[PDB]
Amino acid sequence: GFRSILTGSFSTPCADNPTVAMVEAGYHHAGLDARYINCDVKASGLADAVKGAKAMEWVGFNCSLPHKVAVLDHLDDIAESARLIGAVNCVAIREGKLIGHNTDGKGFLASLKTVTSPAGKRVVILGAGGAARAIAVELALAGAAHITIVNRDASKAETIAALINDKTEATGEAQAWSGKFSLPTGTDILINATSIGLGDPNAAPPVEMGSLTKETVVADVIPNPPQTRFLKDAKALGCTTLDGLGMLVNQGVIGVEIWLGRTLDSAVMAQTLENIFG
Amino acid sequence: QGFRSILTGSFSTPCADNPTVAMVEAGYHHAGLDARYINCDVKASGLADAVKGAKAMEWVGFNCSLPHKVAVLDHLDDIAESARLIGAVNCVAIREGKLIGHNTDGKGFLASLKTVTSPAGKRVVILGAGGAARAIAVELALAGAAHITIVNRDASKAETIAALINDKTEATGEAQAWSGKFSLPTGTDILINATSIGLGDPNAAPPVEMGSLTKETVVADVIPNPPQTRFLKDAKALGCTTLDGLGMLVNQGVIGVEIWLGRTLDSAVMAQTLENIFGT
Ligand SMILES: NC(=O)C1=CN([C@@H]2O[C@H](COP(=O)(O)OP(=O)(O)OC[C@H]3O[C@@H](n4cnc5c(N)ncnc54)[C@H](OP(=O)(O)O)[C@@H]3O)[C@@H](O)[C@H]2O)C=CC1
Numbered sequence: 280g281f282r283s284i285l286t287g288s289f290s291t292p293c294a295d296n297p298t299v300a301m302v303e304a305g306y307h308h309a310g311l312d313a314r315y316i317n318c319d320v321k322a323s324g325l326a327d328a329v330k331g332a333k334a335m336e337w338v339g340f341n342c343s344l345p346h347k348v349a350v351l352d353h354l355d356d357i358a359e360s361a362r363l364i365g366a367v368n369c370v371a372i373r374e375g376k377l378i379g380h381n382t383d384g385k386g387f388l389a390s391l392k393t394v395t396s397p398a399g400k401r402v403v404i405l406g407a408g409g410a411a412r413a414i415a416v417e418l419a420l421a422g423a424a425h426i427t428i429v430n431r432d433a434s435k436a437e438t439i440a441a442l443i444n445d446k447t448e449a450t451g452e453a454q455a456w457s458g459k460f461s462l463p464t465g466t467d468i469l470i471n472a473t474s475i476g477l478g479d480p481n482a483a484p485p486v487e488m489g490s491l492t493k494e495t496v497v498a499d500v501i502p503n504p505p506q507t508r509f510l511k512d513a514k515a516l517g518c519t520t521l522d523g524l525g526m527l528v529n530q531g532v533i534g535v536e537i538w539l540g541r542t543l544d545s546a547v548m549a550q551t552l553e554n555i556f557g
Numbered sequence: 558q559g560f561r562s563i564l565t566g567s568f569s570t571p572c573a574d575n576p577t578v579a580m581v582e583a584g585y586h587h588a589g590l591d592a593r594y595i596n597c598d599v600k601a602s603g604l605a606d607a608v609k610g611a612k613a614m615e616w617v618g619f620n621c622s623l624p625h626k627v628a629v630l631d632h633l634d635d636i637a638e639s640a641r642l643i644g645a646v647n648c649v650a651i652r653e654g655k656l657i658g659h660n661t662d663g664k665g666f667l668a669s670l671k672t673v674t675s676p677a678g679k680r681v682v683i684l685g686a687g688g689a690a691r692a693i694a695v696e697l698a699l700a701g702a703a704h705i706t707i708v709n710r711d712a713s714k715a716e717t718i719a720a721l722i723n724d725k726t727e728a729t730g731e732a733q734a735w736s737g738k739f740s741l742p743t744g745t746d747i748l749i750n751a752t753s754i755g756l757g758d759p760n761a762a763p764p765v766e767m768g769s770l771t772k773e774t775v776v777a778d779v780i781p782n783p784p785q786t787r788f789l790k791d792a793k794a795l796g797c798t799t800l801d802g803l804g805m806l807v808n809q810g811v812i813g814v815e816i817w818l819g820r821t822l823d824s825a826v827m828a829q830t831l832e833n834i835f836g837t
């Protein structure tokens with residue numbers, strides 16, 4: 280049987296997106312006859328690419344820049360977390376119908392779940408972009424007690440906190456970011472969701488790191504380098520840390536679970552990313 | 558370095574038994590080409606969106622098999638000469654958004670033929686009058702064949718192809734009935750089986766007086782599996798130079814990728830891959 284289960288990605292540009300290599304290393308290890316097709320899709324082409332995937336009987340696809348908001352017009356249904364975030368980067372094709380999911384905060388959550396439960400937790404998020412918004416939503420849905428969004432543009436922080444308060448069980452709070460700030464002593468989870476440190480081992484987010492102890496799980500969305508200055512400082516302060524490489528891998532695992540109903544191995548996929556980055 | 562592969566593929570239904578993916582990708586891999594061939598099961602309701610899908614996904618080309626060879630024509634911008642005469646397309650190149658229809662069904666044969674002899678100015682007999690016989694007649698005519706005789710059980714099917722060759726090409730076309738055991742007309746340079754006789758059957762043979770062939774008659778067979786049909790085993794036993802349908806399929810895959818990429822894959826790699834698959 281020469282038919283492979285078909286998955287893929289629509290984005291532009293797509294050449295720097297390593298998802299194909301890690302997902303296919305997952306497929307191979309799991310002995311699944313399935314493929315991940317990395318497509319360069321322009322904004323003008325999205326509608327036809329989506330229809331393509333349905334006609335070619337794909338079971339799902341990812342969507343990256345610039346298609347995350349644009350894709351919503353093509354959906355027949357949408358997951359709660361996806362809808363709250365306002366963006367979709369993982370579409371399932373179920374019985375010819377398109378269902379939108381967001382995994383940008385789900386990757387973080389599964390990494391988080393290896394070390395602690397989000398339920399009842401006090402969370403500080405640095406950043407108020409797409410990633411921060413996604414992480415805040417998934418945290419709140421999973422039972423987090425209190426989420427603080429810290430951002431230079433306070434109005435962006437205000438938007439996320441209001442979302443958290445209005446639409447979830449969690450308490451959301453916005454904080455204007457000006458200089459280093461001290462963490463509340465009761466902070467369980469501190470997440471960098473800014474672009475600080477992206478391809479830059481020396482740049483650290485302005486937070487008072489002495490207000491940070493081993494009682495706080497420190498996380499960073501930066502995929503490469505995975506060992507950011509932020510995580511390296513937190514580690515030396517005794518904190519458990521989680522990195523953006525592990526998070527990115529988990530987006531791939533969650534995606535394939537949504538598409539195929541099968542759980543690929545994160546360890547294998549993380550080593551593929553390690554290979555590519557290294 | 559990096560993660561955008563060249564995308565090619567196939568639209569057909571059903572697609573599970575089509576080994577083109579494995580053959581072509583063995584060529585891609587061996588050449589060091591970051592190119593992929595995506596075997597898609599595409600229902601007739603999905604053909605239009607699949608074609609526009611390949612364009613939007615920025616594929617460089619795709620094959621079409623049953624049941625899309627004729628239906629695809631309506632979704633094309635331009636067509637190559639043989640595909641125009643055949644009225645069917647199995648190989649589409651996407652060039653800066655432009656869809657160009659080609660037919661390679663008889664071009665695999667022609668490539669295989671050319672390793673042993675020129676088609677030009679030659680007298681040819683084709684057994685059968687289906688899709689394969691029609692494609693092979695057209696390619697032969699366009700590559701300079703003098704005379705093409707189409708032999709079929711249903712003589713009116715043979716007539717259709719003869720008239721296509723006579724009216725729309727520079728070659729002379731003749732139709733003949735298949736009266737029991739066929740005797741090869743004197744002076745025939747090339748004899749081709751284009752019937753389905755011998756498909757997955759190493760024992761069934763076209764009803765032909767094999768004694769009518771000369772040692773110099775080139776004898777060819779479309780059947781990909783088994784490559785050595787009874788027909789070709791018997792012709793070889795007489796001393797005839799023979800050409801098998803497995804080599805023809807390899808050549809179709811080579812030609813198709815030349816259409817798409819301007820690159821020639823290793824025919825030996827591809828042949829071995831097919832031989833490994835069919836030997837099961
Ligand atoms: N590992 C994973 O699974 C994932 C990782 N990511 C990564 O997350 C990062 C953020 O993504 P995304 O939300 O799309 O980015 P956006 O451009 O949407 O937002 C970036 C955020 O970073 C803040 N920021 C940037 N520079 C500074 C600075 N010097 N000081 C304080 N704040 C700063 C911005 O603040 P302001 O609002 O004031 O401009 C903004 O809130 C990216 O690097 C991306 O690679 C994303 C998704 C998943």
Ligand SMILES: NC(=O)C1=CN([C@@H]2O[C@H](COP(=O)(O)OP(=O)(O)OC[C@H]3O[C@@H](n4cnc5c(N)ncnc54)[C@H](OP(=O)(O)O)[C@@H]3O)[C@@H](O)[C@H]2O)C=CC1
Nearest residue numbers: 665685686687688689690710711752753756779802805806
């Ligand atoms: N190697 C390659 O590259 C290619 C190989 N092929 C192969 O060629 C073969 C034919 O394909 P296609 O033309 O599409 O098939 P069709 O069904 O279109 O045509 C079948 C032809 O075979 C004749 N035929 C079948 N059985 C007999 C018999 N017992 N006695 C006399 N004549 C017979 C039919 O005669 P009638 O008209 O009287 O029914 C008809 O002319 C297939 O097996 C296919 O796999 C095809 C394309 C390419």
